[PDB]
């Protein structure tokens, strides 16, 4: 669906086209749903320290985080 595509599309803005980073910001492509979701939430609550990932991660609900997670790994 387009819903998931829009939730996810913005991640490519920093993380590179379909998760392939040119550098600096880590890559996304070589990660599965579970890893993505589990660290989104980790950044969100603070558990995992971010420079900007909490600012971004906090912008999403737990449901949306699952959609984003799925869609990036599937694609």
């Amino acid at each position: 669906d387009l819903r998931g595509a829009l939730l996810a599309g913005n991640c490519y803005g920093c993380h590179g086209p379909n998760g392939d980073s040119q550098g600096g910001i880590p890559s996304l492509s070589g990660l599965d749903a579970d890893q993505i979701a589990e660290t989104m939430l980790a950044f969100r609550s603070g558990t995992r320290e971010s420079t900007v990932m909490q600012r971004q991660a906090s912008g999403y609900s737990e449901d949306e985080i699952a959609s984003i997670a799925q869609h990036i790994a599937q694609h």
Binding site: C14, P17, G24
Partner: protein, 393 residues
């Protein structure tokens, strides 16, 4: 075969063209832009600070045709036939559309600051549109003798990239600190507050102490008049002279949006907050700086973000389905110095027909260490190479 014509190959349009083919590869997608190449205003501050050149921030649009099958037309769009669903070019040719995406960026308001018309831009460059102007200002900074004063006059909201003038100050300072250490920067602001003000000022105090003076509008910082002949800026606190002066005039939507009647009184384009279809001419969509997008800054990231939602929405409209619920994000990274980075960042969400920031949005933390600034600098360059890859790879 259904047709989408996209006007402009910058942050908005190129992202739109690519995503249109991603969302429906059955579309005949034509993107129109005066040039085979695009130079980014982002990172042009590093050109001003003599860290890169214009080539290093210029990109080929050819990949959109070669790889993603977007017909790339190198022309100016002169006229929009809204009724006849056609676009007229500068060569006299025409190109028809079932749905039109307009992402033309900004024009400078020539009638806004007394003294500053089209002719004033050679001596008193804005450089708010990159290329020729970036080049002119840098050559000025290079020719300025040590001990001179650079004047930067940013405008009132709203304008393209609200931190941009303050990163410009920062990086010009970086160039001055290592080549012209006596030189001074003077910001004559129309506003009483700016983006990431706390962060910039702490950055300036530590990287460029004593280099930079900031005068708010409330203390007579506003530019009422300028004299392009004499490097003079006139303000309620008096007359100032700059050895180099960067005047940044208030802005509005690109000519094509204005001329076509897509803009309202404010000089920006009102649009359906969900679909970015124009609230004024049906079947034309407006993205990027030219749009009125609620909370969303006039930033490159925003344009790119808006482009995605827009692509999705036009395929929705072209295949007779309801538009989906949309999501956006924007993040403006500023390099206070090449190894000192700060950010303002947000995710966006429709809330009562208005685009609004989610909770969580904010600027870099106030009381952080040097490592943190270094990292955000690394990440800024990451974003830059990444987002341009997405548009032009």
């Amino acid at each position: 075969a259904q047709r989408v014509v996209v006007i402009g190959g910058g942050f908005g349009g190129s992202t739109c063209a690519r995503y249109l083919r991603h969302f429906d590869p059955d579309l005949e997608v034509t993107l129109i832009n005066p040039s085979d190449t695009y130079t980014t205003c982002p990172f042009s501050n590093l050109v001003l600070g003599g860290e890169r050149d214009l080539a290093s921030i210029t990109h080929d649009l050819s990949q959109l045709e070669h790889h993603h099958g977007v017909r790339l037309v190198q022309r100016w769009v002169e006229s929009i036939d809204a009724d006849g669903h056609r676009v007229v070019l500068d060569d006299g040719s025409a190109i028809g559309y079932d749905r039109l995406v307009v992402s033309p960026g900004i024009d400078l308001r020539w009638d806004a600051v007394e003294g500053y018309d089209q002719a004033a831009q050679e001596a008193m460059p804005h450089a708010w549109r990159p290329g020729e102007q970036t080049l002119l200002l840098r050559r000025q900074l290079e020719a300025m003798s040590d001990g001179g004063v650079v004047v930067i006059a940013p405008p009132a909201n709203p304008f393209r990239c609200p931190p941009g003038p303050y990163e410009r100050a920062s990086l010009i300072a970086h160039y001055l600190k290592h080549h012209k250490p006596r030189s001074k920067i003077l910001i004559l602001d129309a506003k009483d507050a700016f983006a990431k003000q706390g962060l910039f000022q702490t950055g300036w105090e530590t990287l460029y102490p004593g280099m930079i003076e900031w005068v708010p509008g409330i203390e007579g910082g506003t530019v009422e008049r300028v004299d392009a002949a004499t490097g003079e800026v006139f303000t309620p606190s008096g007359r100032y002279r700059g050895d180099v002066v960067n005047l940044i005039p208030p802005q509005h939507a690109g000519a094509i949006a204005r001329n076509t009647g897509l803009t309202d009184d404010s000089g920006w384009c009102p649009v359906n907050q969900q679909t970015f279809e124009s609230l004024q001419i049906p079947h034309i969509h407006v993205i990027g700086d030219a749009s009125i997008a609620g909370a969303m800054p006039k930033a490159g990231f925003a344009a790119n973000s808006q482009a995605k939602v827009c692509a999705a929405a036009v395929v929705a409209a072209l295949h007779g389905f309801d538009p989906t619920e949309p999501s956006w994000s924007s993040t403006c990274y500023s390099l206070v110095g090449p190894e000192y980075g700060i950010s303002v960042s947000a995710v966006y969400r429709l809330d009562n027909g208005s685009i609004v920031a989610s909770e969580g949005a904010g600027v870099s933390p106030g009381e952080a260490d040097d490592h943190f600034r270094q990292l955000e600098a690394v990440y800024a360059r990451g974003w830059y190479d990444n987002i341009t890859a997405e548009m032009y790879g």
